[PDB]
Nucleic acid binder design. Structure first.
Ligand code: G1C
Ligand code: CL
Ligand code: CL
Ligand code: CL
Ligand code: MG
Ligand code: NA
Ligand code: NA
Ligand code: NA
Length: 326
DNA sequence: GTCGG
DNA sequence: GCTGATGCGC
DNA sequence: CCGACCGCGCATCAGC
């Protein structure tokens, strides 16, 4: 929080471009700037100083000067006053409602939490569950709770098939003291890039977790990716825990390292690493890292035996999970 | 909105 | 039904 | 300047 005021300002700007303006590149431009500044070990004294960092250009430099001089930004002040922008920004906070849906609802007169509640019929499945747990999904998850959650997930998975390997990734693997949700990477020997010898591998696990009442709702579910809701069990007479978002990704067992790298993040770290990969002539996804031929077409998967091998290919020193929070 | 060639 | 584009989210 | 901006699973829709 050394330059919290500035990073918060850029984040709000980023959210505006994304939610209201539907300008994804500007969104990421602001996010990159916020990121590099949050990483900066000094208390910024001027926009000129900030402009030295990659990602911070003229426009943002001017904004930082204004914020330092007055403690605020007029551009944001006007945005906050705008009701449409405010309404669209708010609605996008519901899981399942993005910029388009948010602008459409506002067009229909639906602009508040109360409005959504009296219009459930106009929401799809995902949006309905996001509204249901709106309050809860805004809460943080203490690492202590993440630990109890990990215990339940790993043990239940083990009960279905001892050959399953469940790994909690996301901010948790990065060592965060609190997480916004739980991210679970899952592998099983019968599912490789070479073949699928067993169907319902992901289904079985989801099923088991619902059986024990851990998973309470489903936002989306396919053969390899589950997106839903879970809840820790509470003791007698005590208030129950908030419901939490849970994502489970089944990845070919032989592509574990690319999968755990992807699912460990951060999202900005992944974007930076994938972009660097390209510059180095490689393309990276959650499955593999491939060289880019002369034409720029991806070649065959390169051998990977650790997360480090991936870093080595793009000529980056290895970075522990805890140092990938950008 | 920012950057490299 | 399928395929492709688009919205959404990780 | 100006083209590039990471890469992809699932739900939903149009058009067939
Ligand atoms: N390449 C890529 N990977 C992504 C992206 N978004 C997410 N990931 C990958 C990297 C992410 O680390 C991982 C998990 O996604 P979460 O949204 O849960 O992100 P975190 O868990 O990091 C925290 Cl925001 P928390 O949940 O605790 O608040 O998915 C994206 O746009 N691109
Ligand atoms: Cl844009
Ligand atoms: Cl791998
Ligand atoms: Cl691939
Ligand atoms: Mg997460
Ligand atoms: Na700069
Ligand atoms: Na949303
Ligand atoms: Na997640």
């Amino acid at each position: 929080t050394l330059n919290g005021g500035i990073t918060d300002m850029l984040t709000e700007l980023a959210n505006f471009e994304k939610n209201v303006s539907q300008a994804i590149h500007k969104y990421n431009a602001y996010r990159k700037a916020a990121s590099v500044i949050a990483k900066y070990p000094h208390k910024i004294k001027s926009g000129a100083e900030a402009k030295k960092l990659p990602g911070v250009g003229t426009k943002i430099a001017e904004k930082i000067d204004e914020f330092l001089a007055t403690g605020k930004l007029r551009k944001l002040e006007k945005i906050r006053q705008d009701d449409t922008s405010s309404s669209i920004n708010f609605l996008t906070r519901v899981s399942g409602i993005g910029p388009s849906a948010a602008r459409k609802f506002v067009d229909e007169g639906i602009k508040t939490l109360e409005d959504l509640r009296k219009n459930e019929d106009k929401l799809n499945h995902h949006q309905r569950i996001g509204l249901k747990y709106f309050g809860d999904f805004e809460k943080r998850i203490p690492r202590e709770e993440m630990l109890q959650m990990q215990d339940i997930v790993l043990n239940e998975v083990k009960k279905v098939d001892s050959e399953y390997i469940a790994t909690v990734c996301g901010s948790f693997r990065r060592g965060a003291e609190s997480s916004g949700d739980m991210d679970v990477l899952l592998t099983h020997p019968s599912f490789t890039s070479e073949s699928t010898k067993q169907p319902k591998l992901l289904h079985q696990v989801v099923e088991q977790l619902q059986k024990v009442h851990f998973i309470t709702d489903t936002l989306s579910k396919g053969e390899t990716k589950f997106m839903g809701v879970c809840q820790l069990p509470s003791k007698n007479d005590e208030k129950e825990y908030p419901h939490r978002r849970i994502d489970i990704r089944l990845i070919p067992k032989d592509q574990y390292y690319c999968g755990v790298l992807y699912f460990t993040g951060s999202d900005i770290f992944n974007k930076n690493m994938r972009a660097h990969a390209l510059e180095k002539g490689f393309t990276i996804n959650e499955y593999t890292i491939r060289p880019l031929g002369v034409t720029g077409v991806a070649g065959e998967p390169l051998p990977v035996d650790s997360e480090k091998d991936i870093f080595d290919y793009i000529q980056w020193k290895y970075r522990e999970p805890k140092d990938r929070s950008e």
